[PDB]
Amino acid sequence: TGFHPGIAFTVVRQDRFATEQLLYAERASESYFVGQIQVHHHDAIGGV
């Protein structure tokens, strides 16, 4: 009805934006080991 009950509120909402990131990496800033490929098969709808 438009009656102020002596109380006030502080609203809070959290939004979301899509950005474009810009990354920089130093030379040899990561070591990396690679293993060996291995194959496995298991039947499915129509074939192997």
Binding site: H42, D43, A44, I45, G46, G47, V48
Partner: protein, 276 residues
Amino acid sequence: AMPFEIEVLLPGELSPAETSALQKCEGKIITFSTLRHRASLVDIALSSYYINGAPPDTLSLLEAYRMRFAAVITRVIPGKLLAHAIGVGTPTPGLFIQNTSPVDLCNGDYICLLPPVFGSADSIRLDSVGLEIVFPLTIPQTLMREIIAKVVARAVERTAAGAQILPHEVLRGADVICYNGRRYELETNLQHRDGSDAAIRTLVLNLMFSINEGCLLLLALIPTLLRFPIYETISSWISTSSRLGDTLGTRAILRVCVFDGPSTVHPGDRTAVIQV
């Protein structure tokens, strides 16, 4: 060892609509009376189940899905049908099956055939040769008893016409089948009071005449529990009940194994299976 492949050579003169219909009716299950490497289109057809010159009822179909050999329809080409056996020992490697049932198959369920007891069946009509083909349902083994016990009971209250039991009750209603977190209402938002009961009434009769004689032979033998040969009756009760029960108590034939895919097979959805 090799699979058991069956070659159903389709005739010509099939309408281009019926060929596209058959192009989608693969993964479904068919049965043969005898298992041979080259079948014909009249061994799959509904006319094979005619018992006394008349189409079969639910009881005859339950008795038939036991004595016949099942087979899954694999790839279909414009010329023929190719189907692999199920029960016999075979290495069938691809063996996918589509779900023709108003429930969802979870990964790991066991599957057993059931004739179309409720409502209607999905049948492909080939009016160019004059024969149709009905496909069994693929329901999980857990509901295989609740479904039949709920479609046979419901058909007894409708027999209780004549003030034998109150037909005015709405206290108990909505006989549903809850599975995988979904409620399948059984009345199917319409009234199939006729057509469905007339195709099940023989099973209902054989169960009435067998439960009614169980709670009376016992009372005749032991009167304190609460010219009419008695031993012949003891014999003819067990002989009938034990011969009617195995028809109902069926076992599973496939199992839903699923890699790389979703865990639930919706109604009208494909999935891979293995042989029990």
